[PDB]
């Protein structure tokens, strides 16, 4: 009876095994664009992904992760609300069974078709496992996906998904360039929050970009063909792997832009 996204193990159950689910700095949240405060003290984000080394793609039974080599400062995020250098370790997505839902973060209650998370950890803690125990240990870049035109830079990801259909499968995935997933503008909202899957630790500085990227109906259809289950256990399509919005409680969302 492991956690997941179904009727009987889904987000409304998670608190029984992970009491921090009802904590004071849980994610995701709804971003109220009229209540977000412009903070002109926020620096622009610095994304240096020109030396990124992707290694592998895998289906971990709740999403697919593309993993990067994080043994040196090769793909890093700096600037913005962050002190220090945060290394990219993996990215993944959350998506829906239909185009009108899928994202974790919402903007004035609007859901997008999917949400990309680029996960980075604070190099001062030395590894990822130590970073998740600290309040400033991780920085996640969140990017919304809407359905429209195809994103060429995602097609390489879509094409290998057939080879990792079921839980526990992996495949070599070298020379993928994550710069092909970024929108044009780097304006962002930021707030302190949590992992959105168990263990839901409150170690994340969230940076959510204002500008969505567009993907095609056909691209996102291919995400929906993946499986939560292992080979060949009964087929359960990996859809709606998103956590609903949580109470903002005592936090302020800040914007880098007016």
We find the least distance from the C-beta atom of residue 38 to Zn ion, in angstroms, to be: 26
The number of residues in the chain equals 258
Number of residues that bind Zn ion (CB under 5 A): 1
Kindly state the smallest distance separating residue 70's Cβ from Zn ion, in Å.
17
Is 105 noted as a catalytic residue in this protein? no
Residue 53 known to bind ligand: no
Give the residue with the Cβ less far from Zn ion, 117 or 169.
117
Residue nearest to Zn ion (CB): 117
Looking at 2, 62, 105, 120, which residue is catalytic?
62
Nearer to Zn ion, 94 or 169 (CB): 94
**Least CB distance from residue 204 to Zn ion, whole Å?**
10
Instruction: List the x/- string, 89-128, binding to Zn ion by CB under 5 A.
Output: ----------------------------x-----------
Which of 205/250 has CB closer to Zn ion? 205
Shortest distance (Å) from residue 178 CB to Zn ion: 15
Tell me: is residue 106 an annotated ligand-binding position: no
In this structure, what are the phi and psi dihedrals at residue 156, rounded to the nearest 5 degrees?
A: -60, -35
Nearer to Zn ion, 87 or 94 (CB): 94
Task: Establish whether 120 is an annotated binding residue.
Answer: no
Q: Point out the annotated binding site for Zn(2+).
A: 92, 94, 117
In the complex, the residues that contact Zn ion under the rule CB under 5 A are 117
Residues comprising the binding site? 92, 94, 117, 196-197
Q: Which residues are catalytic?
A: 62
């Amino acid at each position: 009876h492991h956690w997941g996204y179904g009727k009987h193990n889904g987000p409304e159950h998670w608190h029984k095994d992970f009491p921090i689910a009802k904590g004071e700095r849980q994610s995701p949240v709804d971003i109220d664009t009229h209540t977000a405060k412009y903070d002109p003290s926020l620096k622009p984000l610095s994304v240096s992904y020109d030396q990124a080394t992707s290694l592998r793609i895998l289906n971990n039974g709740h999403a697919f992760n593309v993993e990067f080599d994080d043994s040196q400062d090769k793909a890093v995020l700096k600037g913005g609300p962050l002190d220090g250098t945060y290394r990219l370790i993996q990215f993944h997505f959350h998506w829906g069974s239909l185009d009108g839902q899928g994202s974790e973060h919402t903007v004035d209650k609007k859901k997008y078709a999917a949400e990309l998370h680029l996960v980075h950890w604070n190099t001062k803690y030395g590894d990822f496992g130590k970073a998740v125990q600290q309040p400033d240990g991780l920085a996640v870049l969140g990017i919304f996906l809407k359905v429209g035109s195809a994103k060429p830079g995602l097609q390489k990801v879509v094409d290998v998904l057939d080879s990792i259909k079921t839980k526990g499968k992996s495949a070599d995935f070298t020379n993928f360039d994550p710069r092909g997933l970024l929108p044009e503008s780097l304006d962002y909202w930021t707030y302190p929050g949590s992992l959105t899957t168990p263990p839901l630790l409150e170690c994340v500085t969230w940076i959510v970009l204002k500008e969505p990227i567009s993907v095609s109906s056909e691209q996102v259809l291919k995400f929906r063909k993946l499986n939560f289950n292992g080979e060949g256990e009964p087929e359960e399509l990996m859809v709606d792997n998103w956590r609903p919005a949580q109470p903002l409680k005592n936090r302020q969302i800040k914007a880098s832009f007016k």
